[PDB]
Structures are given as structure tokens and as C-alpha cells.
Amino acid sequence: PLWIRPDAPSRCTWQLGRPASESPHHHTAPAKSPKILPDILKKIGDTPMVRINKIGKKFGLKCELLAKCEFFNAGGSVKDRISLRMIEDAERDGTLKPGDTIIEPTSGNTGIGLALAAAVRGYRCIIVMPEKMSSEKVDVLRALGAEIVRTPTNARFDSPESHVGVAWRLKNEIPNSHILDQYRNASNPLAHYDTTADEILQQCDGKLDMLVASVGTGGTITGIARKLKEKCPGCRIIGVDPEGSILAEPEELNQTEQTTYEVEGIGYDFIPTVLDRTVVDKWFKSNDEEAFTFARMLIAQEGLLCGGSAGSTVAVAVKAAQELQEGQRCVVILPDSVRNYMTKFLSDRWMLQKGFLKEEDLTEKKPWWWHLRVQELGLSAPLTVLPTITCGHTIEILREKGFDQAPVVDEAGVILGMVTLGNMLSSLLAGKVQPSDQVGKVIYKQFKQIRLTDTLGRLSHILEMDHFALVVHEQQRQMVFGVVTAIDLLNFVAAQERDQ
Amino acid sequence: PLWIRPDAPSRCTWQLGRPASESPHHHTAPAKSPKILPDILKKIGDTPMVRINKIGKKFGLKCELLAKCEFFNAGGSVKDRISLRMIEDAERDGTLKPGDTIIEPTSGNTGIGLALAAAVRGYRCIIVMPEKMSSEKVDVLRALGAEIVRTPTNARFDSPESHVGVAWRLKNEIPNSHILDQYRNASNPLAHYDTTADEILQQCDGKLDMLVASVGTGGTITGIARKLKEKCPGCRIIGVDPEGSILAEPEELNQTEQTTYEVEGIGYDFIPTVLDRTVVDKWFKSNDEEAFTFARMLIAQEGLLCGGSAGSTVAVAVKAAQELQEGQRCVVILPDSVRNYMTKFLSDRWMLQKGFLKEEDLTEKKPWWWHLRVQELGLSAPLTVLPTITCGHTIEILREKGFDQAPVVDEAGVILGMVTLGNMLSSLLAGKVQPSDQVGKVIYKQFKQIRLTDTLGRLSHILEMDHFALVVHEQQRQMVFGVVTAIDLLNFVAAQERDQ
Ligand code: HEM
Ligand code: HEM
Ligand SMILES: Cc1ncc(COP(=O)(O)O)c(CNOCC(=O)O)c1O
Ligand SMILES: *Cc1c(COP(=O)(O)O)cnc(C)c1O
């Protein structure tokens, strides 16, 4: 054998109405976890179901909206369930022997799950991931001891250089290596059929009207839907597919004028073998802008520290569940954590750079003082001192001159930092410094320079990283107009709105 | 007025032996949580107790070593317990009213917990955090809607510029604002006494011989130790304090040169009111190098995606628990998650820059091929094509000349990217491009240039971010000597390993 296509038609003869006895598959029943877990892999599953309290109401939902929070799994994603299940079944099968090598083509989360289990169980782990996936995924994979290979983001799945193609190529060169293959492996949807779906039914007391889930491999939606069609046939199954992907039906939904997208984990250029599209009642297409808008809303309004595809899911859910009435219930799957996207959608700079926040239209929720300039604060000219000054002479000069702080500026005009009366006194009284010592241990070295013409909004951002902003002269660096801290900005804002 | 010292002596009349009936505090009994959580704040507590299987044995421990994993709480840390309890108690005692302002001096984790609860409950949240704390904490705080103020890392606690001093100064300027004050609030150690400690006892069947906990506010170790001294008196309480802090006893342990350190959340320049050192049996001084070495070891060997102070705790535990025999049990508290330190200890560049990792220890464990040069791969000079070539002509020339890929190089010598036979054919068969089209839609624009003199170790790092490495000449107009992928390095290593 050279390669097995990830989109080959499924040979599963499952049909709704067919009893469980007829299944050729091994089904693992959820097991009572002991008081002390023997390893972290037992902390995969039994994820919380949390009511959404603000977002549903905001978008006019009448029904109850609940979120299945899969980011609480050991590795931080829903994929920890399939990572563990694929390994356990392969071990039981005799396929995976001790110390063997696991190679897996992944968008990140299956790779993390497999790398975590490989770290614990003692397997060599090689992950093949497209170039677009976050550096935070790489960082965690490296820490877990996984070897990482990258493939071009725009490589077609059936090309030699796709993540799938490269994984098979590496397996062919490494003896004792296996590709568990999440795109074809029944252990993927069966993990969701046996556990994720059983948890949802248990948590809902078997009463559920709608399920919304984003689609990558299709294991989550397939596993959950097959079980729900058997146990709760009245539950409508809603699939979420990004614009650029071809998973959605009817095919008319996939005719778009763009092929790439920023959201990670969902959508493909092929139909994975594990995806059963017949069990999905309706599909909705999502875009990056609404996915990141909703992910940021989930964090800001619900405190759910989830990722991009979780935003895509809730963005669809508020449209899809509009038809539900009071008393009815909609469940959404939140697949992964914000950890994977710290420097991506979590960053306003990244959102702006990608055009997902219109800066001009963002200024509508910005305070009245945001666009005012630094000079309007009424800056007090500060006294400056040389770095050669003693701790004792610093106390003398600040008290003699009536200042509580002083920037330290050398003979060449370089601003070295700040010294305060309070800190110098506290350090002296605690014996940290002697009066004759130089100010080296007491000086506050970190500060940001700002112009008289900079905005107060710029100042506000600066004050989230530094304690003080030093207002300088563009033509005389040694010349400091003022020292501004968060307290000065508050005093200004408060005084202005205590008289108008 | 204006401020109450966070180190004022405790007025608590608790003493070991006093019946719980004499406590004047409110005590919450942990109760079963509902199937569906009304909000994410209910996902605080009931944290896992996980057996440490490799690290303990590696350092010669005979006892069982267990980890109480607090990073599974809603906000990612142990502090989510105290954030919720401080708010709940303040609401119940009438001090905190709907829509009031919460201001808190924090190292980050209490701020995250409070910001999460404030986002859910609808309170304005202002965090005052030292400059050393990670930018990852700032990014999560921003996403939750908290306002962020920073203070100098080297500001003495009693100076006006400390995180506690600034929080009080802000409160005095904001009407209807409150400082819950984790340094003096009984709700901090009470959260641990009522819930964390009872969980540890439930999980251990009331039988454990040693508890190791790192110390910041002291709420965790004080709450747990007061309950453990009452219900498991044989348990040894071990406190972990970083070098640079003054919390440890005897004072002789604290006679260190420096007072600054990279580990976050532990150690202080004052004794917090909530810290009861009389219930700590022994202190150990930890350092940054061992804290990060152990946090990386916990990830790599145990799959525990924890933070820096978790590493400090386990670094001490493998020393403190040496006195225990086979059959005894040591429990460590792992306070937060790796999410807060993505670009800090998780990064090898940061570790190198800080001196916690040396090129010597970085090498040794490196494979035999690591220091070989790219030139030793035995590169083949590739066929290059112009960017004006058609998709049809690309198929023809690659097949005709016997190549599977070609760099695209313009007449000025600029490398635009790569084209492949496989991707071009798949694109054509799927109707993405027409034979007469130029290759703009198929070209792989992302690649990394490498030199013939660079090492295979450098190539390996490059291959964790890019699929293609193009070997070039610094003197000629970017003339390509060869194209390398992860398959090409594996082919070189595997063939040479057969000869060896
Ligand atoms: C109880 C009813 C079911 C029957 C009678 C059935 C039957 C089969 C048969 C005959 C095969 C081909 C042999 C093989 O690959 O093992 C198969 C494959 C498979 N089954 Fe099932 N199955 C059932 C339920 C399920 C469920 C609930 C899932 C979802 C989690 C599932 C997922 C799969 C997958 C993904 C394959 C792989 C297809 C391939 O290799 O092309 N099956 N099934
Ligand atoms: C034997 C039982 C206890 C007695 C008689 C006791 C008594 C007191 C009293 C009289 C106060 C003064 C303020 C107030 O009444 O609210 C107090 C404060 C305090 N208690 Fe309790 N307490 C007991 C147990 C605990 C426990 C189990 C903890 C948690 C580990 C705790 C932590 C504190 C703290 C941190 C303070 C703040 C000290 C201050 O007000 O400056 N106490 N306690
Ligand atoms: C963030 C995220 N959301 C959503 C999903 C979609 O889940 P499913 O593939 O089960 O439909 C995934 C799964 N991506 O494909 C496997 C992988 O992580 O390597 C995902 O990672
Ligand atoms: C606060 C904190 C600690 C110390 O716990 P306390 O309850 O404050 O003693 C340890 N680790 C981290 C990361 C924390 O932020």
C-alpha cells in the first residue's frame, strides 16, 4: 500500500432504525473516574454544559441556549476525545505496539491531543500541520515533545505536499510508524457517538430541540447526530461550514468568490470518509468576520475562553435557532480554547491588520476623551536629576523642591528612568539602600516616551503596559514636559465630567 | 485613611484545637452542581487530583506524588475560587451592589478571575498589575473587559506606586468602587479552607502525608493547612517561596542578593494579613531556573499544561518528599495554566535570552546530524520557471524534464514561490484553473531561504514553520542550489542510519 485517500466513500452500513447489536464496532461505555486519576488522559470527557445568558437574548432567541464547553479537556479541545480513542482502539487492535511512532495530518488540535497522549504513554509523535495554523499550536506541540512538519495552506488534499499526502510519505520512510488517520478512522465519530452524545443526553435529561456544530473531519457532528437521531429524533442537526469549504449541502451554498480563510479547524476541500452528511438536517455557511466577532463576544459577555470555530458555531446558532420557541432548547459545541489564538483574533492589532474590525466604525463605542491630546492634561514640568545622585541627596532635593518624583537624565540627555520620594524613603527605611548609594536599585527603568501631540487613547493603551508615560520634546530629548500615569488620566476624566 | 496596609497583623483568633462552632465567619459547604451550569462561574472547583508517574520516580521519590490541578477552573487558575468567593460574600453582606466597581491589586490570576466574574455579573473591573506580569494576562484581561493599570516591579509595597498603593488611590477617585483585597479578605483563605481542602481530603480518603504549596497571598496554604491540621494532623505543610521574597521562615533562608525574579504569582516584600505562617511546617526557597525546568518537565513528561509556580512547587516537592517512604503520599498544588506564559518559559528563545537554558544543555541531547551542513544533503539544482508560465506549460515542462516541482523566479532573479506537478494537476482537474491561465492562483508563495552553510538543526527548526526551504547564494541574484522539505531530511537521516 502507498496511500489511502481521506475522502473514499464510507463502507458503513449504519441506518437509522437498525439496532446496536448489529454494529461490528467496539463501543466503550463511559466509565466512573476514580478519586485520583492515574494520569491526565482521564481528564478528557465529561465537559460542562453551560447556559448562554446574554448572547441569545441579544440576538432575539426565545429558547434556552446551552454551550458544551470542550475546551476544558486536558489538551484544551474536543479532539482530545478522538486522540485518546484512536490510540486506545489501535492498542487493543494490536496495530499500535509500545514505543511505536504516531504520525498524524492535523489542523492542530488532534495533533496536540495525540502529542499529549504520546508524551504520557511513551510514543514517538510526528505532526503534519498546514502553514496557516497558529504558532501557539506549534509552541504546545514542541513542549509536548512532538516533531513538527508543515505543508502549504493552499495545497490541494490529493497533491503530494498536502498535510495528508506528506503524512503518508513520512510513514513510508519510518519503520514502526502508524497513521491513525482521523479522516477515515471510525474511532473518531465513535468517540462522539459513545461519549460526547451520551453526555449531552445525560445533561439535557434527554430533552433537546436543536444541536449546532461546526464541521472539520465531521466526526463530532456525525457521532452526535447518529446517536441523537436514535435517542432524540426531534432534535434538529445544524452543520456549520466556512465560506471556502465544500462540506455543506446543497452544493449551491459553496459557490463563493474566495478560497482561503483565517478560522482554524473547520472546512475542507474534500468530504472526509467519517462525515455522514445524510444525518445533517441543515447547513449554514460562516465567515471569518462573524466567527471572530462572536468568539470575542463569548469571552466578553459569557466569560467563555473559547476559540475561533466556537464563534462560528454561536454566530450560526443565533440565526438557526430563531424558529425555536420559549421552553425549547438549543445546544452548541464549543470546540477549543483561546490559548491557540493569543496572537491571532485575541489581538486587536491582528484583527485590524486582517480587516475584521473597521477602525473608523469602532470609534463609535470610544470615550469622549479618546481623541483629545496629551498636552490638554495640564502637565507639570518635572525636576530632573543626574544618575550620579545619591539616595540621600535624592530625598533632600525632592523634599526641598517640593516634588514627589524626578526623571533621571544623564549628561548626554538620555532619559534613564524615574526615582520617587516614596520609594526612595521606603527603600532607605527598610535598609535596602544606604544614603550614600547611587540610585541603581531604586530607579524605575521602564517607561514609554510620548509626544505632546499624541492622543489620550494612545496614552490609555500605553498605560496597560507601563506605569508612566514621559512627555518629551521632539528636538530636545533631555527635555521632559511632564510625567503621566493612570491616576493623572483618571483625575482629568473625572474632573471634566463632574461639572458638565 | 486613604489605605489599609496589606501586611497589618491578623486579628483572627483561630488557634488549632478551637471547634468550628466558634468561628465567626460564614462557611460554605461544597454541594453537588447541576447538570446544566447556570453560568461559567459554577465551573470553579472540583478540580482533578492526578498521579505524577515519571517525575517523582526520576528524582528517587518512594511515595506516591499527586497533583491538585487548579488550572482546570473557568479562568485557568486556583484564583478563580477566591475571586468568586470574595464577590459572593461581598454581595451577601451588602457591600457590593449591582453595577458597582471592583478594583484589585493583582499579579494577574486574581484579576482574571475577578474580570471573568465581573463580565458575567455586570460589574466594572479595574486591575492594577506589576509591570513584570506576562502580556498573555493583559490580553485575557482586555478580552474580558477589564481596565488595566500597571505598576513598577521594583516598587516597594508601601510606596504610592505599588500595585496595592495605586489600587487604593484609584478607589478614592471612583465613586461606588470597592477593593475586595485578597491580602486581607478572609474570603481568600476561607475559600480554600471550605472547598479546596475538603476536595483534597475527599480525593485522598483523608489520608495524605505531605502537602506542598507555593505562596503568594498565602490564602491557599493557610486555608488548606488550617483544615488539614484539623482533619489530617499528621500531614506536613511545606511552603514554597521564591529567592527574592521574604515570606519564608526562618529569616535566614531569605538572605539573598537580588529581590527580582521571573516566576509569577509567588513571593512578596511583605507578609500578607491572610498568611498564617504558624501552620507551615517547613519552607523551601525556589529559584527561576528550577521552576521553568520543572514546568517544562511537567508538560513534557506528564502532559500537565501548567504554569511557572507549578514548576516551583514540584521542584521543591522532589526534595521535601525524600523523607517519605513507599506507601506514603505527597500532594502538590499546581496553581495556573501554560496559557499565561506562551511567549515566556514556553519559548526556547525566551529561556535562552534569560539564561535559563544554555547552548551546552541545548546540545548533547541533539541527534548526530544536528551540526551537519545543508550542503551535506547532496542537493540537486532545480529547474526554475518564469511567473508568466501557463498552468498547462508547467505540467508539460515538469513531466518532460522529469521534475515534480519548480521554484518560480522572475527575470530580475526574485524568487516568487514554488509550483508542483501534483497541485497544478489537481487544480486543473477540479476546475480551479484553466490551461491557459498564469500560475498566480496555484503558486505556493510561502517559503524560507536557507544557506548551504547553515546546519541541519537550523533546517529542522525552519521546517517547523515552513514546508519549503530554498537553498540560495548570498553573492549571486538569489540563485537556487536546491529545494529541501522535511521528507528530504528524513531521507538523508534514514539512508545514513542504514549505512551506520
Ligand atoms: C450499529 C450500526 C452500524 C453498522 C451495522 C455499521 C457497519 C459498518 C461496516 C460493515 C463497516 C465496514 C467495515 C469497517 O470499516 O469496519 C463500517 C465502517 C465504518 N463505520 Fe460503522 N456501522 C455502524 C455504526 C457506526 C457508527 C455509529 C459510526 C459512527 C461513529 C460508524 C462509523 C464508521 C466509519 C467511520 C467506518 C469506516 C468506513 C471505511 O472504512 O470506509 N459506524 N461500519
Ligand atoms: C477557630 C475559629 C476562628 C475564630 C474564632 C476566628 C475569629 C476571627 C475574628 C474574631 C476575626 C476578626 C474579624 C471578624 O470578626 O470578621 C477574624 C478574622 C480573620 N479570620 Fe477568622 N477565625 C476563625 C477561623 C478562621 C479560618 C478557618 C480562617 C481561614 C483559613 C480564618 C481567616 C481569617 C482572616 C484572614 C481574618 C482577617 C484578619 C483581620 O481582620 O485583620 N479564620 N477571625
Ligand atoms: C477548533 C476546531 N473546531 C472544530 C473542529 C471540527 O470538529 P470535527 O472535525 O469533529 O467536525 C475542529 C477539528 N479539526 O480537525 C481535527 C484537528 O483538530 O486536527 C477543531 O480543531
Ligand atoms: C496567587 C498565585 C499563587 C499563590 O497562591 P496564594 O493563594 O496567593 O498563596 C501561586 N501561583 C500562581 C500562578 C498564583 O498567581
Numbering used by the authors:
A (entry chain B), B (entry chain A): 41 to 540
What does the paper say about this structure?
In addition to the spectroscopic, catalytic and cellular consequences of AOAA binding to CBS, we solved the crystal structure of HsCBS in complex with AOAA to gain knowledge about its molecular interactions. The overall fold and structure of HsCBS complexed with AOAA was found largely similar to the basal conformation of HsCBS reported previously. Refinement and iterative model building eventually yielded structure, in which observed electron densities correspond to PLP bound to K119 in chain A and PLP-AOAA adduct in chain B. In chain A, the PLP cofactor binds a conserved K119 residue via a Schiff base bond, thus forming internal aldimine, which is stabilized in the catalytic cavity by multiple hydrogen-bonding interactions with the surrounding residues. The presence of the PLP-AOAA adduct induced a rearrangement of the amino acids involved in the stabilization of the cofactor. Although the linkage between PLP and K119 is broken, the residue remains in close proximity and participates in the stabilization of the phosphate moiety. The AOAA moiety of the PLP-AOAA oxime intermediate extends toward the entrance to the catalytic cavity and is stabilized by a new network of hydrogen bonds with residues T146, T150 and Q222 in addition to S147 and N149 residues involved in stabilization of the K119-PLP internal aldimine. Indeed, unlike in the case of PLP-AOAA oxime type external aldimine, the PLP-Ser external aldimine of HsCBS formed a richer network of hydrogen bonds, particularly with G305 and Y308, which poised this complex toward the formation of PLP-aminoacrylate intermediate and thus continuation of the catalytic cycle. Conformation of the loops L145-148, L170-174 and L192-202 in HsCBS complexed with AOAA is very similar to those in HsCBS, i.e. the collapsed (closed) conformation, suggesting that the inhibitor (and likely the substrate as well) does not induce further changes in these loops. In conclusion, here we demonstrated that AOAA covalently binds to HsCBS forming external aldimine featuring oxime bond, which leads to inhibition of CBS activity.
